Amino acid sequence: EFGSFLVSLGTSFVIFVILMLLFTWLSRKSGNAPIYYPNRILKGLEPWEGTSLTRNPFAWMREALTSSEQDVVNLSGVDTAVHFVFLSTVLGIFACSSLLLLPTLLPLAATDNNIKNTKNATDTTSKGTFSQLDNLSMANITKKSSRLWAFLGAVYWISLVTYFFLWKAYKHVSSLRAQALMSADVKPEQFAILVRDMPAPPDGQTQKEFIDSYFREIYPETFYRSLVATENSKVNKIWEKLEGYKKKLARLINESVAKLETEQKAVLAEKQQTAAVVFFTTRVAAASAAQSLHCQMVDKWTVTEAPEPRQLLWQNLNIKLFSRIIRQYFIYFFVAVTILFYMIPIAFVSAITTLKNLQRIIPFIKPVVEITAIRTVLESFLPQIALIVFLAMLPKLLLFLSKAEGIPSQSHAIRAASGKYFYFSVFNVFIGVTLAGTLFNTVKDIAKNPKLDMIINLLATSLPKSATFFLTYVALKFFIGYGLELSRIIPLIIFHLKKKYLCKTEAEVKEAWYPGDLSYATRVPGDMLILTITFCYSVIAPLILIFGITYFGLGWLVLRNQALKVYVPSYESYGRMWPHIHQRILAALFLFQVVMFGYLGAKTFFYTALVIPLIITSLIFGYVCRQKFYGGFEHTALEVACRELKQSPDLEEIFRAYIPH
Amino acid sequence: EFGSFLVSLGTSFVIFVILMLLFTWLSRKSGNAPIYYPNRILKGLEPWEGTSLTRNPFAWMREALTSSEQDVVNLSGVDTAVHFVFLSTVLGIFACSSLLLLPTLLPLAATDNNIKNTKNATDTTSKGTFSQLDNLSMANITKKSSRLWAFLGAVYWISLVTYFFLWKAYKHVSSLRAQALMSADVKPEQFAILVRDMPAPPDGQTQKEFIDSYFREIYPETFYRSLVATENSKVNKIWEKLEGYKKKLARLINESVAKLETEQKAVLAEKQQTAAVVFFTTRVAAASAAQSLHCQMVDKWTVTEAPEPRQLLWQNLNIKLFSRIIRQYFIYFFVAVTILFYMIPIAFVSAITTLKNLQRIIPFIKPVVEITAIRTVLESFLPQIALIVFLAMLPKLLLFLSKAEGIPSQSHAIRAASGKYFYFSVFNVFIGVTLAGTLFNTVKDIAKNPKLDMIINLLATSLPKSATFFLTYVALKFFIGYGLELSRIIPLIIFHLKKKYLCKTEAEVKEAWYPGDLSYATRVPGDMLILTITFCYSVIAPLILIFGITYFGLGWLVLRNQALKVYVPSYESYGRMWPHIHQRILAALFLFQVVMFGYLGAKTFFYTALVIPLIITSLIFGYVCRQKFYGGFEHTALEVACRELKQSPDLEEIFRAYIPH
């Protein structure tokens, strides 16, 4: 496989060179401003800096490297800042860990020869079964070791560093959240409530008046209005989407309006059911109402904190708690079945990966056609591309599933997608590649040698070989992905094709060049894969830390110049993602700990019980942390909803902001 | 060991007969009313029923078996009712599970002979190594089985039943909580708040006025007063305790008062620091204030729900969040070290348990003096008594530790004790006894036979033998404990000794006969041990279900006639224990599942992966449940603090209720 690693890494450098070189040329062209420098045009701030020259080649860099933390916050938001905190803390963990671990352990994993001793019993002339593997706590560390002590103390170094960083971070994100919250404006969200599970109207009372009185009693000076309506039904949601389509085509009529009106009225003709956004009067009242159980026997009047208008997911605002729980259960069962099918395809990937060992026996004669040329390529671009493809259809499905539970707020739904993706990822990817590699190799080598005193050694061999494969994958990703992102070559092609053969109006060009968000449902989930792989295989094969620094490090560079210069944020959750990210980073430390308790044992290190203490510490850190911080990342404090509102918060305008269409 | 089981069970029946017979005699004596029928005297309701006869022998039974659920609630409280719900749901799980499982599996574990086949390879005439073990998915089920299918489908039956019951329960407890909450009275707790982490006063402002303004701004019509004071210091806590001692002796003076005043004043002379109980005006305001984050950056103004006066743990009201987290961490580390030392003593217990196998070679022939007589007794009363002793010093320590974290409210502190005890229990007890038995027996008999095809079989043998030992333990407990409880012979002795040779006044007798609570920090933790043992060893040895029904079943009988007739409740948490109990019961289902995935595998049942699906379901059930219910078991709803307060809630009296001394 060394030959193949060399190809993949090599080729990817070629692509990064060509794509990044393209960037340094296509950006200078001012006619490409709408796809290289947006978020500087939409928010009128001039395509780039004062035109002047052509911006010394390395200019994007200077800007990114000297962009103030606060500058990101003001320009983009307090969500971009949190993503950047994520990237940075991971980077740091990796950095320090790397330093120490790397030097020590790399010099200590070549100064042994368990691979060569294993090679004393490798059936018959088994050539090229390793190479370069001899540089990673692999099959090259003799069982009873006296050197494995260093590969346990390492677990501590990574772990302790993970703790310092995650704590320091939670604090820093919290500071950001508050600061931002205490420095905002009116905002149509700081005055609402979202009741979602209301009981039925009584005798012949109108739904509106029912809600009206209830809230007007508890708070008899703050109730203002109440927008129920079920948003003219979701069938009208669809009809208005179609009316938008029609006006776009202008840039059916009568009968279509008829349809809309009729369906909407006929559905409201009995009950608009639950879901209203009781708009309060002053903010403190709305804030207090938010964090307060309005009824015991939790199944009636569930009051949340009311999402901003842009993310209220009016579709699933109804539900009824019974249905919500049924949905939760079914959705979780489906994600588990999907984890199993993906295990199937990932086994497929690792198989495609070890070609010699595959052709050895599994299909035996079937792939005897593998020569040397085809071999290298089919195990240097194919296996990797497969993983990308499979784990790319996931983000979409996961969101659709999560948004079918009932979660109001797109923010929480994106967070749930991220979570289900973490599960998938972890389990599938890691376990799969690792175990499958191991199994293949060790299978037609275990059929002969029995006992057990050798089987564990062979299984460890194979664990580090799967490590080398994941390394090449991470590399590929990093290079090509960041290349494409900085070049935005895909979007460039699209825009400069539309603005040449498809754009009819100037508004059309405007529509075409609108950038998008940082897609926090494909970025963070995907970056979590890299986190887990580079955490687990950090001591078992310490080279996926020198590839890991690069991924997350190029992150803070590429993505910064893709946030102060292109992606314009969609929603704003004032930092409400860190809790999720923190739990996941800590769960990687935990999976890593469980695996570095297993592997250390297979390589017979009787004192491997000294990793159990850490398996506990992680779990305690969890509880302790959540208690201290999660609270603040949940609600808007009363001390933020009591700040001076100079201009009397004009209501009615606020009421008209949550208005459906 | 069969001989010993027969002795222990037999002897314990003797004790239950003698103690329960004593009860049916000593209770009739009316002069024993103060220790057999309190909580009927304190709350003037006449010692028993209309005196009339002598109450047909079985009278306690009739009363208990026909005591209304609500009658328990009104007489005692909404905490006794929840304990009874606990006992009952566990009973039910066990009941149904038992039915099915038992019949099927017992007839299927004697109709095989893996014990006899193992006995074909028992070195040299190993006699008495088993007996009666041949009736419990033990060493008597042949490896590849075709009968083990039934012992997997069983895991499902127990699991599914556990789910039905736990759900049905959460609902029922919630209904109780609310009903009770919507039918109470004024109560000095429904109008307070407990701020605990206040920032320092500003320039030269007085602590009081600082708190005063802050809250009087956010709520400018509901702030009434504020009791800070640090309760004249805890040194004065001690001094007032001593003044109470002095008045009791009356039933030092001057210099002691001097001490008190001086220390108190000197400590308040700088700052009474944090912790005030801002008393609001109307209940809805207090309720809203409770569930509301009064400041972002959670480290200032932490507002809880304010414990009732009787449980405000004024001692640890101060702290400061930094210190609280340090304490949390240290306390958890200490509980882990204690778990390790207890593992040491529990290994000691199982060792004392298998005497033949112990003397085999472990202490050489140091104990070759074991004959037959001494043998039976030293393994029928000794091992068991040891476990009781050890696991009885735990409750006290655990509370002391938990109340040193900082938890305000004795209710939560008792809950935390319960939790740490669960951990201890589970780990220690189960793992210990099981594994140690196994190890002993399979430690000399493995030094010979190598391979592995036999080692697993031997390990399973030993797992079921440890099962038989736990069975006898549970029995012992049940019998003797409930005997003592119904007889209250220990307390009788004490009272009728004081009221004969130690009581000086009538108030002294009153003091002596005051019963106590149901000690929810020794009952529930201890009953959780029995739950776990009888859950784990429910399929591995299905006979600890017919001993389990009895424990929890005699519970609802004995303890009922020990709650409507003796223990007068101390605090009232309106049901806030069920969340804890539910999580723990579910964690037993989980430990059981993990062990019935291990054992089923050791007895080579290749399709043992079908227990993994359930290991997931449990965890999902967890999340789903907490989400739906825990909320309601956290705060007092606004719809409960808006109910008609006919008599204007006299404040000042409420303020004077939280007054320190």
Residue numbers in the entry:
A (entry chain A), B (entry chain B): 2 to 252, 287 to 696
What did the paper state?
Inspired by the observation of the extended state of AtOSCA1.1 channels in the nanodisc, we attempted to solve the high-resolution structure of another member of the OSCA/TMEM63 channel family, the higher pressure activated mechanosensitive atOSCA3.1 channel which exhibits a half activation pressure threshold that is much higher than that of AtOSCA1.1. Our high-resolution cryo-EM data obtained in a detergent environment contain two conformations of AtOSCA3.1 channels. One is identical to our previously low-resolution model of AtOSCA3.113, which we call an extended state. The other is a more compact contracted state. We analyzed each monomer of AtOSCA3.1 in the two states and found that the single monomer of the contracted state superimposes with the extended state. Therefore, the major conformational change occurs in the central cavity. In the contracted state, each subunit of the M5 and M6 linker forms another dimer interface through an L487 interaction. Therefore, the area of the central cavity is reduced compared to the extended state. The disruption of the M5 and M6 linker interaction and extension of the central cavity is likely an energy barrier for channel transition to the extended state and then opening of the channel. Furthermore, the dimer interface of the AtOSCA3.1 in the contracted state was ‘locked’ by the interaction between each single subunit through the M5 and M6 linker, presumably providing an additional energy barrier to overcome during activation.
Mechanosensitive (MS) ion channels are a ubiquitous type of molecular force sensor sensing forces from the surrounding bilayer. Here we determine the structures of plant and mammalian OSCA/TMEM63 proteins, allowing us to identify essential elements for mechanotransduction and propose roles for putative bound lipids in OSCA/TMEM63 mechanosensation. Briefly, the central cavity created by the dimer interface couples each subunit and modulates dimeric OSCA/TMEM63 channel mechanosensitivity through the modulating lipids while the cytosolic side of the pore is gated by a plug lipid that prevents the ion permeation.
